Amino acid sequence: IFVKTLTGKTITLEVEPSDTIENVKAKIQDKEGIPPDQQRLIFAGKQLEDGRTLSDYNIQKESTLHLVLRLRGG
Amino acid sequence: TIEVLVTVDGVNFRTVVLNNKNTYRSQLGCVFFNGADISDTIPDEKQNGHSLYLADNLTADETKALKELYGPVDPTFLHRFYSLKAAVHGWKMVVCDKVRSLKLSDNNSYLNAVIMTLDLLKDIKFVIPALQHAFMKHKGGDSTDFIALIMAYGNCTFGAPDDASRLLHTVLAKAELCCSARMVWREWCNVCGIKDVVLQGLKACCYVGVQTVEDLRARMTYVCQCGGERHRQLVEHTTPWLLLSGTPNEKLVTTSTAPDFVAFNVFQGIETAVGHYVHARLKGGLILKFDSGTVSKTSDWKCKVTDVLFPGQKYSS
Ligand SMILES: [Zn+2]
């Protein structure tokens, strides 16, 4: 599927949806520099939580995920 | 040699007899006694007959209770939850005109924003017993359990700055709505056709990507799978409140415009660095800013709004 950085480079990498959001973020650490820890993916207005499964979100191939960087508030 | 009561839920207890030749951890495991991690201490008569909270080396039965009480958590959850509870015991809430807000300490402003927002959500409850109970306690005036719990669930670390908006939505993923909310999206294409996409309950009161009511309703054009424009628009919406969240974006909050929202969160600082969260509400045609216990008021404010909270929706198109 497609994932876009806010006003930024958008790549698509496809992996069969058995995958846990932890794993999309995990293959994301293997394709772009960022650590799964800091990456929060947003799809169709919902933050994807690590526990649930791409299949769970009705996400079809060629669908658009959004990568937002975790903010640090103190 | 002493006897101690071991539990993970405060309802089921077992006797564990201990000697004083190794540490508590050596003989039993990671244990808390009155909030204190005493795992690496040697058992003494003071703790005789007393109850202890165990975090690992769980029984088969205790594990069953852990899952029931807290849901499926990683093995470190209990240690993290209990320790966070002790770490955060010293945090203070200040109350202004009955509004409770968490006093700034150890980079916790993001939490002040999460809690103050949650305090505003009508008719919500948590699926996880432990979380629900902690929540009820939170509303009772005792917020330690709820705070520590939410950090454990959010995999926050005490003292480290963290994203407010992100935590708010993980927390809500554990909640449910006690009333009826409904939102319906209509998508259409001349070849594929029309599609109604329905959301009910909490799912109908939250959206990440938009921070204004108009933008949620406004018609959105893109390309369909078949190789043409797919359109999308909101065609019904009936909610008790509406939580819209997006990236820190700069705007002017004005009460002259006679806003729709009851409250909003603001991110102060730069984004590639460590900032500060502030919770703000409109009551009084004025924006009351709750800066982690510190209260101030403005007519308008140049700020980067993240989360926005709207009242109940009754919309049809
Ligand atoms: Zn189409």
- Tally of domains in chain A: 1
**Options 2.40.110.10, 3.40.50.261, 3.10.20.540, 1.10.3720.10; CATH of B1-54:** 3.10.20.540
The Cα B100–Cα B6 span in angstroms is 35
- What's the CA-to-centroid distance between A44 and ligand 1, angstroms? 18
Among the partner residues B160, B208, B275, nearest to A42 by beta-carbon distance: B208
For residues B224 and B189, is the Cβ–Cβ distance under 8 A? Answer: yes
* A8 Cβ under 8 Å from any chain B Cβ: no
Helix (H, G, I), strand (E, B) or coil at B51: strand
Per-residue buried b or exposed e for B171-192, using 16+ beta carbons within 10 Å of the residue's own CB: bbbbbebeeebebbbbbebeee
- For chain B, residues classed under CATH 1.10.8.1190 are 55-181
Q: Which residues constitute the domain of residue A39? A: 1-74
**CATH 2.60.120.1680 domain span(s) along chain B:** 182-317
Task: HSE, CB side, 13 Å, CA atoms: give it for residue A47.
Answer: 24
Q: Please, where are the H alpha helices in chain B?
A: 24-27, 60-70, 77-87, 109-118, 129-138, 144-153, 164-172, 213-217
Inspect the interface and report whether the beta carbons of B165 and A71 lie closer than 8 Å: yes
Q: How far apart are CA B97 and CA B37, in angstroms?
A: 37
Interchain pair A51, B169: CB under 8 A: no
Any idea how long chain B is?
Answer: 317
Q: Given the DSSP bridges, would you call strands A72-73 and B274-282 parallel, antiparallel or unpaired? A: parallel
Residues of A with CB below 8 A from B71's CB? none
CATH topology classification for B55-181: Helicase, Ruva Protein; domain 3 (1.10.8)
Residue B153 C-alpha, separation from nearest chain A C-alpha, in angstroms: 11
- How far apart (Å, rounded) are the C-alpha atoms in residues A4 and B251? 24
The CATH fold assigned to B182-317 is: Jelly Rolls (2.60.120)
- Comparing alpha-carbon positions, the chain A residue that sits nearest to B72 is A51
Asked whether the beta carbons of residue A72 and residue B109 sit closer than 8 angstroms, the reply is no
Cα gap B287→A16, rounded to integer Å: 48
d(CA B244, CA B261): 10
* Chain B residue nearest residue A71, CA to CA: B163
Q: Does B2 touch chain A (CB under 8 A)?
A: no
**B19 contacts: CB under 8 Å, gap ≥ 6:** B1, B27, B43
- Tell me the CA–centroid distance for residue A60 and ligand 1, in Å: 14
CATH 3.10.20.540 domain extents, chain B: 1-54
Contacts of A73 in chain B (CB under 8 A): 107, 109-110, 113, 161-164, 267, 274-277
Method: X-ray
Distances (CA, A) of B7 to A25, B30, B35, B109, B128: 36, 12, 14, 33, 19
Closest partner CB to A72 (pick from B72, B162, B203): B162
3-state secondary structure of A64: strand
Q: Tokens at residue A50, please?
A: 């690590």
